[PDB]
Subunit: 255 residues, 3 copies
C-alpha cells in the first residue's frame, strides 16, 4: 500500500505545474525512498526529471515499488479542487488501476476524496546527465524568470553567453534587441539573492524562448535556479526541493 | 408612481446576477408589498423565483400593481454603470413604457439617471412548491459553492445522496471521480457556519452540473443556502434575503 | 548625441499608452528644449499631440534636432520589459538607424539595454488648435473616465451639451439611455476634485464613444482633464504633464 502525504497540498501542484505546460502523460515511479518521474515533450528537446525525497513529505510509506502513470490534464483538474494547504495524500494499493487523492483541512468538518484513472504507459527512462558541465551558475529564480520573459518579447531565440565572471543573456529580434548582463557577487542582507559562477570553459548557446518560458514555471518551487551549461550537451536547469529537485534538460539550437 | 430605492445598489445587481446567467427576459411584478419575479430557462429545467420585501429596500412605494418585464442583458449593462453602494432607485409611472434607474453617491455632486426600454412579455406564472420535501439541509453558501465547483471539474453530473445524518456529494467522471461527505453539527464560534439536516425520507438525486454552477451564483446574497430535496419533485435551492429570497427550482435527471 | 532620462520609466509607458490604442507609427521630434510627437488614426478623426518639457525628465540632452519615428507596437513591447521606476534613458546618435532604451534599478546589480529599429516615415505635421474655444471645462480625469465608460455601455454615441453652468453628458441607446449632469463648483478638502467651466457660447456636440474611450487612457497621466469645445472645430482633450502635455483632437459627428 502507498501513502504519500504532502504537508501542504500546494507543492504537489507546483511541481506538476512545471510538467503540464509541455509534457503530457508521465510515469511516477514510487518506491520506498521516494518518487521519481520523467517525461519528454513531443519534439524531444525538453526533458523534465523529478525527484521527491521522503523528507519533502509529511509522511511517506511505500511497501514496494509502484509505477503509476497518469494524464496531467486530468490530474491538474483534481489538483484544482485542492485548495492550498490541505495535507494531500496519495493512496494506492498493489497493482492499482487507480490512485486516490485525499484532501483535508485544519477543521475536521471538511474532507474530500478523489480518484484518478491510471494509464498503462511504456517509458524508456533516460539518464543523460553529464559528469562535468563547462559552466555552472546560480541566481534568483525570480531574476531569471524576469530576464526570460522580457527578452521573450522579441524573437523566439534567447542566447546565453558566458565568459569569465560575465553572464550575458541576449535576444536579437526582428523589431529590435535586448541584452541583460549580470555578474557574480556575494550579498549579505540575503546571501541567496546573489549570483554564483564556475567557468571551466566559456559557452555560447542559443535556446528556444518557448521552452525557457516553460522552464521558469518551476521558479515557484525554489528561490534559486541552477543552470549548468555545456557546448555539446543539453543545458541543465534545476530548481532544488527541500529533499530532491525538478530538472529541465533543454537542447540548444544547432545554428 | 413606483419608487423602489435600494440602500446599496449592489444587491440589485447580485440578485439579477442569479438570473442573467441562465434566464433571458423576466417580468418583475411590483406591488404595494414588494417585488416578485419569475423566469425559466430554455430547456425548462431551472426556474428562478425572486421575492423582495419592503424591508429589503431603504424606501419603497407602489401606488398600484405594475408588471415591468425587461431584458437582463440590457439591465445588467445599466447596472455596470452602477458603482456599488449608490442608493439605486427604480422609478416608473402608470402603464409605463420605460423604467428609470437612478444612482446617487454620498457626495451630492454626482448623480446619474438611466432609462431602460421595457418589453411586453406574456408569462404563465408557476407555483410548483411542494408542501413537504423528503429532505431539508442548511449549509454555508461558500461551502456548497466549493463542492459544486470542484466536482464540476469532472463529469457534468453531480449526485447528491442523503441518508440519516449523512450528506454525500458525488461526481463520477470519465477521467476520475470525487466525493465530499459532510455531516450535520452545531458550531458556536459562528453558529452560521454549521450544517443542518431534517430527513423524512432519504434521497438519491442527480443534477446537471451546469445548472448547479448557476445556482451558486446566489451565494453572494446569503451566508447560507437552503436545499430542499424530493425524489419525485425538483429540488429547491434558496438564498434568504433580509426580507424575501431567491429560489432555484431544479429538476433532477431521469436516469 | 541624445540622452533623455525619465526618472520613473512608468510615465513614458503611460504616454505611449494614450497613443498605441489608436495611432500606429509616430515621429518623435527630439530637440534641445524637449520632445514633441504627433499622430493621426486611420479615419483621421483623432489626432494625438504630445509635448515633453525638459523638466519632465531627470536629465535631458539633445545636441541637435533628431526626428525618430517608431512602431508603437514594437516600442510598447520593450516598455513591457521595463518594470516600473527604472530610470529609462533614451539614447541615440547622429542620423541614427536605432534608438537605445536603457533601464536601471536602485541596486546597480541589474541593468538592461534594449534597441529598437527605427523607421523612415513622412509626416505632414498639423497645427489645428484654435485661438478661442466656445467652452472650456476642467474636471477630475477619474470622473470623466467613469462617465464615458458608463455611457459607452449604451449606443456608440455620447453627446456633450453645455449651457451656462451646466455640463450634460448623454447617451441614447437602442436598449435605453443615460444622462450625467455635473455643475461647476469649488472644493477645499481637495480643490483639484472640483469642476470648472468658462462658457462663451453653448455647445451641443456628439462624439464617437470608441474614441472617447481611447482619450481617457491618458487619465493615468493627470488628476484633471482639460476639455475645450467648439461647435465648428474638433474638441481638445488635454492631460497636463509636469512640463508639457498630451492632447487629443477629436472631430464631432456631422449629424
Amino acid at each position: 500500500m502507498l501513502e504519500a502525504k504532502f504537508e501542504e497540498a500546494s507543492l504537489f501542484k507546483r511541481i506538476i505545474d512545471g510538467f503540464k505546460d509541455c509534457v503530457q502523460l508521465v510515469n511516477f515511479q514510487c518506491k520506498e525512498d521516494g518518487i521519481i518521474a520523467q517525461a519528454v515533450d513531443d519534439s524531444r528537446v525538453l526533458l523534465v526529471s523529478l525527484e521527491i525525497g521522503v523528507e519533502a513529505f509529511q509522511e511517506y510509506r511505500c511497501d514496494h515499488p509502484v509505477t503509476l502513470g497518469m494524464d496531467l490534464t486530468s490530474l491538474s483538474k483534481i489538483l484544482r479542487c485542492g485548495n492550498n494547504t490541505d495535507t494531500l495524500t496519495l493512496i494506492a494499493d498493489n497493482t492499482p488501476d487507480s490512485i486516490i487523492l485525499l484532501f483535508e483541512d485544519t477543521k475536521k468538518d471538511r474532507i474530500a476524496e478523489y480518484s484518478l484513472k491510471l494509464m498503462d504507459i511504456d517509458a524508456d527512462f533516460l539518464k543523460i546527465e553529464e559528469l562535468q558541465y563547462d559552466s555552472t551558475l546560480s541566481l534568483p529564480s525570480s531574476e531569471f524568470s524576469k530576464i526570460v520573459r522580457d527578452l521573450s518579447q522579441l524573437s523566439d531565440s534567447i542566447n546565453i553567453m558566458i565568459t569569465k565572471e560575465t553572464i550575458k543573456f541576449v535576444a536579437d529580434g526582428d523589431i529590435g534587441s535586448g541584452t541583460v548582463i549580470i555578474k557574480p557577487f556575494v550579498d549579505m542582507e540575503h546571501p541567496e539573492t546573489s549570483i554564483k559562477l564556475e567557468m571551466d570553459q566559456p559557452v555560447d548557446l542559443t535556446f528556444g524562448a518557448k521552452y525557457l518560458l516553460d522552464i521558469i514555471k518551476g521558479s515557484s518551487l525554489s528561490d534559486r535556479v541552477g543552470i549548468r551549461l555545456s557546448s555539446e550537451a543539453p543545458a541543465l536547469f534545476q530548481f532544488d526541493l527541500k529533499s530532491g529537485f525538478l530538472q529541465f534538460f533543454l537542447a540548444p539550437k544547432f545554428n
